[PDB]
Amino acid sequence: GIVEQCCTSICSLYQLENYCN
Amino acid sequence: FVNQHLCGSHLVEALYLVCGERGXFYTPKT
Numbered sequence: 001g002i003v004e005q006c007c008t009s010i011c012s013l014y015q016l017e018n019y020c021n
Numbered sequence: 022f023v024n025q026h027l028c029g030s031h032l033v034e035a036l037y038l039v040c041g042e043r044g045x046f047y048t049p050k051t
Binding site: 001005007010011016017019020 | 022023027032039
Protein backbone atom coordinates (compact mmCIF):
# COMPACT_ATOMS: atom_id res chain seq x y z
CA GLY A 1 0.00 0.00 0.00
CA ILE A 2 1.40 3.40 1.17
CA VAL A 3 3.69 4.41 4.10
CA GLU A 4 2.54 7.90 5.30
CA GLN A 5 -1.22 6.88 5.17
CA CYS A 6 -2.63 10.13 6.74
CA CYS A 7 -4.99 8.48 9.39
CA THR A 8 -4.22 11.22 12.07
CA SER A 9 -7.36 13.41 11.61
CA ILE A 10 -10.21 12.65 9.12
CA CYS A 11 -8.32 13.04 5.85
CA SER A 12 -9.06 15.94 3.45
CA LEU A 13 -8.73 15.15 -0.30
CA TYR A 14 -5.53 17.34 -0.44
CA GLN A 15 -3.92 14.80 2.00
CA LEU A 16 -5.18 11.81 -0.08
CA GLU A 17 -3.66 13.31 -3.31
CA ASN A 18 -0.20 12.44 -1.80
CA TYR A 19 -1.07 8.76 -2.59
CA CYS A 20 -2.66 9.58 -5.99
CA ASN A 21 0.60 11.39 -7.03
CA PHE B 22 -13.14 10.22 4.62
CA VAL B 23 -16.20 12.19 5.94
CA ASN B 24 -16.65 10.67 9.47
CA GLN B 25 -14.21 8.98 11.93
CA HIS B 26 -11.88 7.40 10.67
CA LEU B 27 -9.28 6.08 8.14
CA CYS B 28 -7.05 3.04 9.03
CA GLY B 29 -7.01 0.01 9.31
CA SER B 30 -9.89 0.29 6.72
CA HIS B 31 -11.70 3.08 4.68
CA LEU B 32 -8.35 4.54 3.35
CA VAL B 33 -8.40 2.38 0.16
CA GLU B 34 -12.14 3.17 -0.41
CA ALA B 35 -11.38 6.92 -0.15
CA LEU B 36 -8.37 6.57 -2.54
CA TYR B 37 -10.34 4.47 -5.13
CA LEU B 38 -12.79 7.46 -5.39
CA VAL B 39 -10.25 10.39 -5.09
CA CYS B 40 -7.33 9.15 -7.27
CA GLY B 41 -8.48 9.97 -10.85
CA GLU B 42 -11.04 11.83 -13.06
CA ARG B 43 -13.55 9.03 -12.14
CA GLY B 44 -11.32 7.69 -9.31
CA UNK B 45 -9.06 4.61 -9.93
CA PHE B 46 -5.94 4.60 -7.61
CA TYR B 47 -3.35 1.78 -8.16
CA THR B 48 -3.14 -1.68 -6.47
CA PRO B 49 -0.43 -4.31 -7.36
CA LYS B 50 -1.01 -8.08 -7.97
CA THR B 51 1.24 -11.24 -8.13
